[PDB]
Amino acid sequence: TQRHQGRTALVTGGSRGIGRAISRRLAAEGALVAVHYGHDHAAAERTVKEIETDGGRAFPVHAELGVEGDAATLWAAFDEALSGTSGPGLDILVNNAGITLPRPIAAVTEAEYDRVFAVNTRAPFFIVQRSLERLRDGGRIISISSAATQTAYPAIVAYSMSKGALDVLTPALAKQLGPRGITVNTVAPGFTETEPEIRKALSSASVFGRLGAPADIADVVSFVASDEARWVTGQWIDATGGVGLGL
Amino acid sequence: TQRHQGRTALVTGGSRGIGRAISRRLAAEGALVAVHYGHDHAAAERTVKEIETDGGRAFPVHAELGVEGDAATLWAAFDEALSGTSGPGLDILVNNAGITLPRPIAAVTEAEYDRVFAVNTRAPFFIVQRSLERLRDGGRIISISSAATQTAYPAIVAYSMSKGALDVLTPALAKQLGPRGITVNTVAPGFTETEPEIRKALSSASVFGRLGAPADIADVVSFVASDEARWVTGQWIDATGGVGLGL
Amino acid sequence: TQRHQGRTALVTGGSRGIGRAISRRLAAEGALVAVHYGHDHAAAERTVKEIETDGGRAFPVHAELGVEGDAATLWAAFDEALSGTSGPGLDILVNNAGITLPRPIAAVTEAEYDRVFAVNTRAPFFIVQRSLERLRDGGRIISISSAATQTAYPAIVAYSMSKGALDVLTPALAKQLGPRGITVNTVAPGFTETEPEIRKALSSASVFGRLGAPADIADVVSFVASDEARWVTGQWIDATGGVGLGL
Amino acid sequence: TQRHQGRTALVTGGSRGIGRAISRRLAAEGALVAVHYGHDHAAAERTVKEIETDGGRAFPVHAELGVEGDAATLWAAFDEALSGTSGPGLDILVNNAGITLPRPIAAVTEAEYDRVFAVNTRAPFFIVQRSLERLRDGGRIISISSAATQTAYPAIVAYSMSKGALDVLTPALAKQLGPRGITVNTVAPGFTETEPEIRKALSSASVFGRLGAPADIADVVSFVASDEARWVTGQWIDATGGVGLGL
């Protein structure tokens, strides 16, 4: 396609699963992709080489999220990488970094709560805040949310709340950034097989009666990030295979 | 792109404005496009030749909508065209046919009401009903709605109600047709310049402070109609430039 | 409570089921209730006497809906009743009149479609239009919709579309009528037992695992119609026992 | 009315503004009201005496929110109060405690962010978690949110995100608690005058062209908390005077 020819993308948690497919799709369409990772160096290097093997350009960016100085670290390491190279600006920010918390309310601890909010809400918020100094006109902010923000799923309530908070950011920034031709969208995956009775309920929650694949999400994100989605902003884009549709 | 290589599309009111850009985008990506028209023969022939000049294939399909035997006529004329040719099936249905009624409630007559419901709701409903016998697996139903179904616009209330009714159809069919890998989506345009103080309020209703162009809608529709949007179904896809976002 | 002391209400299809409980609740709180009916004279007389027995005031209003001159007939008969009596104005309009069409798309006929749109959309629209000349400041318009407008229920698709259209009217009029302190709301019932496997799916579609009762709806409508809901307008008020909540 | 005769309510931030009107409305309808406060002892004592003067029963409950051991402290102090008295159970939880952060993204500090999340999300979450052990059948959880969760208001983005997260909790718990006849709802106030160009934009954001009063919210909350709203659950109840309706 070559829809992102000449552009610079950053994908938080870009090293694997959904993060990885996004990084790959964007890099395959000409984007220079900053592949962010917090823990998994080898997976980052894996994703980058994969991209380079296929004839795109990407580079690793190390920042542990949900720790004091996470956002600063991320953007410090992004600049360090581009310096003496493409300028300090970017076109496409994808907030994909996240940790799960599969506990209903009765079992969620302060430690687990604080951890999920630190990584899933606080990190992306300050990453985005510091993004706005660098984000060019016609740019893209894309937050990866969950079906569970808009469909009641008690067993992951604290996780869903973390994504809910980030969903409020999308319309706020689409309004603020609109005059510069920047779109801000949420893409909400459903239940995705990445790398007993649960697997069954989640497959059949789709009207297509399967789990999503990383490629399912990455295909929607690649569109939202293109000039073709320039008239689409402030939206919650359902990438769940029709989760929550009926009953 | 060639995203619709080998597929058959039907675009109701495909002869001009949004209808025309959709027809053109789809035909430019390899779709064989049935260009439907109710009144404007020359505009239909115009759109078809344009497509053929550019090296796609399309053909005219005549059916006056909101008259007894409209849906039958349409599908009679679609088949007549494909017969002894591509088989009777289709991949992509776009409900774009519509008439405006810019009157607030106090001024809407029975004649005008009945006319807008006949064209905007009753016609597309029976066109879709008769579509389901012909619609192949992995197919696409795309209804063109309005921003005014989800954002209060009193001055066009009866028109909005007509589109509202058709918006209920999208989730219903996405559930029913899901098992066959068919997606059903609404694409909602905003205020679009096609071929005094009104023009100003409508431009600035967008967070981008302009009217839409036909291409803005057609770019979103082309995506929804592609294999890239296969994980997107039952949705109301906002193609308004962020109309109704703030306040 | 006596929340509607001194007010005049009209409840379309007020003779039984949900219509009847609404009529009764409003009349029990001091409202003078015009009990509309299209076919069922005895049921109307039944509801009125019931109300009078309990020490409220109500009167019958005959108008066959979905026939040429329905809205005119209704308001002609409302005035005929109040004339030489309370003035021609009203405080509370409840659009409760409706007919079901339990057929999925493949089986809906033109006759059945046209009938459901005539009764469920066209009748209430022109009843409301003609209401606005008579509707006092601090007044109430309340449309009775269905859970199936916002939750995919293919088996009643054409019925849902009819209610969908009327749902677009609520926000339109809440904006137009706002300056006069009039609220316009939709109240959406779920599945309600009025006077095999279906009954089971509908009971368990509620998070409370029962069907609604008429009183469940009438309690919400009585609130929306009171000065207590004066800050609530343009809303789709869910009276379904949490239908469509999870999955 | 006496709708809450025999019931026990807890209103977080119940000492003034919206908190206070809620406390008063509930206590005026027979509820025993635990008036929570974090800083403002005199305001708490003020609200309690007011209630007692009018012939309801209420008591103060001290807990600084957004500090380690806030939820424990609150419930420790609730029990201490009821002990040797009404049992340890409650019927009605109102999450009204909140702090504002009127800064757009460019100006939000970590300190301010962490403070607003601690008070507005983390505190109510763990207050609710610990509530579920005590909450009786037919009970009520009511979260006080903001219009700005569903209408883009960039200038208060971090505050809105905090309320967004709590909005995800409502549908989750309405599903989980449904079988016990407990309703969980959000009530979203707009812009409310409590105890230059801003005041003007906020008044005219309502279709009624005024700011809300505490009583506007408290009237809706009193309904949601009554047996009359028993069929209303998982909902986002708009108490904004039609903020965000048009454009």
Radius of gyration of chain A (CA): 17
Could you tell me where the beta strands, DSSP code E, fall in B64-108?
A: 90-95
Token duo for residue D220: 């809706």
Vertex C134, ends C130 and C138: CA angle to 5°? 120
Nearest-CB residue to B239 (from A208, A223, A231) = A231
Q: Phi first, then psi: what are they for D224, rounded to 5°?
A: -55, -40
B-C C-beta contacts closer than 8 Å: 107
Q: Which chains touch A (3 or more CB pairs under 8 A)?
A: B, C, D
CB-based contact, A232 to chain C, within 8 Å:
no
Please give the Cα distance from C182 to C175 (Å, whole number): 10
Catalytic annotation, pick one of B37, B113, B153, B159: B159
CB-based contact, D206 to chain C, within 8 Å:
yes
Contact B135, B90 (CB under 8 A): yes
Burial of C210 (0-12, 13-18, 19+ CB in 10 A): middle
Please give the Cα distance from A5 to C112 (Å, whole number): 54
Token duo for residue D68: 């380690």
Give residue D217's identity as a one-letter amino acid code: I
Contact check, Cβ <8 Å, A219/B228:
yes
Closest CA–CA distance from residue D233 to any residue of chain A (Å)? 12
Q: Which domains are seen in chain C, by residue range?
A: 8-239 (3.40.50.720)
User: What was the experiment behind these coordinates?
Assistant: X-ray
Q: Classify residue B212 by its DSSP letter.
A: B
Nearest-CB residue to C152 (from A153, A154, A246) = A246
- Chain C residue numbers touching D1 (CB-CB < 8 A): 1
Sole residue written with tokens 């300028």:
A87
Token duo for residue B69: 């035997």
Vertex A162, ends A160 and A166: CA angle to 5°? 110
CB neighbours of A141 closer than 8 A, spacing ≥ 6? A93, A95, A128, A131, A135, A170, A173, A177, A182, A183, A184, A185
Contact C224, C140 (CB under 8 A): yes
B-D C-beta contacts closer than 8 Å: 24
Sole residue written with tokens 């740019």:
A139
CB neighbours of B28 closer than 8 A, spacing ≥ 6? B51, B54, B56
Give residue B115's identity as a one-letter amino acid code: R
The count of other CB atoms within 10 Å of the CB of residue C40 is: 13
CB-based contact, C223 to chain B, within 8 Å:
no
Please give the Cα distance from D234 to D140 (Å, whole number): 11
Contact B12, B42 (CB under 8 A): no
Please give the Cα distance from C44 to C38 (Å, whole number): 9
Please give the Cα distance from B170 to C75 (Å, whole number): 36
Give residue C158's identity as a one-letter amino acid code: A
Q: Which chains touch D (3 or more CB pairs under 8 A)?
A: A, B, C
Please give the Cα distance from B235 to D104 (Å, whole number): 31
Q: How far out from the chain centre does Cα A4 lie?
A: 17
What sign does the CA torsion over D23, D25, D27, D31 have? negative
Closest CA–CA distance from residue D174 to any residue of chain A (Å)? 8
End-to-end CA distance of chain B: 39
Token duo for residue C43: 């049921």
Token duo for residue A56: 């795109």
The count of other CB atoms within 10 Å of the CB of residue D41 is: 12
- With residues binned 3-state (H G I as helix, E B as strand, rest as coil), the percentages for chain B, rounded to 5, are 45, 20, 35
- Chain D residue numbers touching C212 (CB-CB < 8 A): 231
End-to-end CA distance of chain A: 39
Sole residue written with tokens 């009641």:
A152
Q: Phi first, then psi: what are they for B139, rounded to 5°?
A: -75, 180
Contact check, Cβ <8 Å, A151/C246:
yes
Give residue A155's identity as a one-letter amino acid code: A
Name the pairing type of β-strands B58-62 and B32-37.
parallel
Could you tell me where the beta strands, DSSP code E, fall in chain B?
A: 8-11, 32-37, 58-62, 90-95, 135-144, 183-189, 236-239
Contact C80, C59 (CB under 8 A): no
Nearest-CB residue to B164 (from C164, C173, C234) = C164
Helices B123-131 and B70-82: crossing angle, nearest 10°? 40
CB neighbours of A110 closer than 8 A, spacing ≥ 6? D126
Token duo for residue A108: 């969620």
Q: Phi first, then psi: what are they for B241, rounded to 5°?
A: 60, 40
Largest CA distance in chain C: 57
SS3 per residue for D153-220: CHHHHHHHHHHHHHHHHHHHHHHHHHHHCCEEEEEEECCECCCCHHHHHHHHHCCCCCCECHHHHHHH
Q: How many residues are recorded in chain C?
A: 247
Nearest to B32 by CA among B11, B3, B58, B61: B58
How many angstroms separate the Cα of C11 from the Cα of each of C5, C121, C236?
17, 15, 18
Nearest to D124 by CA among D95, D93, D145, D104: D95
CB-based contact, B209 to chain D, within 8 Å:
no
SS3 per residue for C48-76: HHHHHHHCCCEEEEECCCCCCCHHHHHHH
Q: Which residues pair with D239 in a beta bridge?
A: D189
Burial of B99 (0-12, 13-18, 19+ CB in 10 A): middle
Please give the Cα distance from C121 to C134 (Å, whole number): 21
CA atoms within a 13 Å half-sphere pointing along the CA-CB vector of A229 = 30
Give residue A91's identity as a one-letter amino acid code: D
SS3 per residue for chain A: CCCCCCCEEEECCCCCHHHHHHHHHHHHCCCEEEEEECCCHHHHHHHHHHHHHHCCCEEEEECCCCCCCHHHHHHHHHHHHHCCCCCCCEEEEEECCCCCCCCCHHHCCHHHHHHHHHHHHHHHHHHHHHHCCCEEEEEEEEEECCHHHCCECHHHHHHHHHHHHHHHHHHHHHHHHHHHCCEEEEEEECCECCCCHHHHHHHHHCCCCCCECHHHHHHHHHHHCCHHHCCCCCCEEEECCCCCCEC
How many angstroms separate the Cα of D197 from the Cα of each of B16, B43, D146, D175, D200?
45, 51, 20, 42, 5
CB-based contact, C150 to chain D, within 8 Å:
no
Please give the Cα distance from D97 to B61 (Å, whole number): 62
Please give the Cα distance from A217 to D4 (Å, whole number): 48
Contact D27, D3 (CB under 8 A): no
Contact D58, D47 (CB under 8 A): yes
Give residue B217's identity as a one-letter amino acid code: I
Q: Classify residue B123 by its DSSP letter.
A: H
Q: Which residues pair with A192 in a beta bridge?
A: A212
Sole residue written with tokens 């779109």:
A183
Please give the Cα distance from C125 to B104 (Å, whole number): 12
Please give the Cα distance from A105 to A113 (Å, whole number): 10
Vertex B19, ends B15 and B20: CA angle to 5°? 55
Please give the Cα distance from D44 to D39 (Å, whole number): 9
Interface of A with C in 124-143 (CB under 8 A): none
Q: How many residues are recorded in chain D?
A: 247
Q: Strand D183-189's sheet: what is its strand order?
A: D58-62, D32-37, D8-11, D90-95, D135-144, D183-189, D236-239
Contact B227, B5 (CB under 8 A): no
CB-based contact, A230 to chain D, within 8 Å:
no
SS3 call for B173: helix
Give residue B77's identity as a one-letter amino acid code: A
- Chain B residue numbers touching C113 (CB-CB < 8 A): 122, 125-126
**C142 Ramachandran zone, left/alpha/beta (phi>0; psi -120 to 50):** beta
Q: Classify residue C122 by its DSSP letter.
A: I
Contact B214, B18 (CB under 8 A): yes
- Chain D residue numbers touching B148 (CB-CB < 8 A): none
What sign does the CA torsion over C5, C10, C15, C16 have? negative
Q: How far out from the chain centre does Cα D71 lie?
A: 15
Contact A80, A45 (CB under 8 A): no
Render chain D in DSSP notation, one character per residue: --TTTT-EEEETT-SSHHHHHHHHHHHHTT-EEEEEESS-HHHHHHHHHHHHHHT--EEEEE--SSSTTHHHHHHHHHHHHHTT---S-EEEEEE---------GGG--HHHHHHHHIIIIIHHHHHHHHHTTTEEEEEEEEEE--GGGTSB-GGGHHHHHHHHHHHHHHHHHHHHHGGGT-EEEEEEE-SB----HHHHHHHHHSTTSS-B-HHHHHHHHHHHTSGGGTT--S-EEEESSSTT-B-
Please give the Cα distance from D194 to D214 (Å, whole number): 6
Please give the Cα distance from B234 to A246 (Å, whole number): 10
- Chain B residue numbers touching C164 (CB-CB < 8 A): 164-165, 167-168
Contact C14, C47 (CB under 8 A): yes
Contact check, Cβ <8 Å, D244/B244:
yes
Give residue C6's identity as a one-letter amino acid code: G
Which spans in B120-179 are helix H?
123-131, 157-177
- Nearest chain A residue to B221 by CA distance is A228
Buried b (16+ CB within 10 A) or exposed e, A188-201: bbbbbeeeeeeeee
Vertex A36, ends A31 and A42: CA angle to 5°? 110
Q: How many residues are recorded in chain B?
A: 247
Q: Strand C58-62's sheet: what is its strand order?
A: C58-62, C32-37, C8-11, C90-95, C135-144, C183-189, C236-239
SS3 call for C99: coil
Nearest to A10 by CA among A78, A93, A130: A93
Contact C221, C187 (CB under 8 A): yes
SS3 per residue for C161-179: HHHHHHHHHHHHHHHHHHH
Contact B79, B63 (CB under 8 A): no
Nearest to C243 by CA among D235, B173, D224: D235
Helix (H) or strand (E) holding B77: helix B70-82
CB neighbours of B208 closer than 8 A, spacing ≥ 6? A178, A179, A181, A233, B241, B242
Q: Which residues pair with D36 in a beta bridge?
A: D61
Helices A70-82 and A123-131: crossing angle, nearest 10°? 40
Token duo for residue B140: 């696409």
The count of other CB atoms within 10 Å of the CB of residue D223 is: 26
The count of other CB atoms within 10 Å of the CB of residue A225 is: 29
CB-based contact, A218 to chain C, within 8 Å:
no
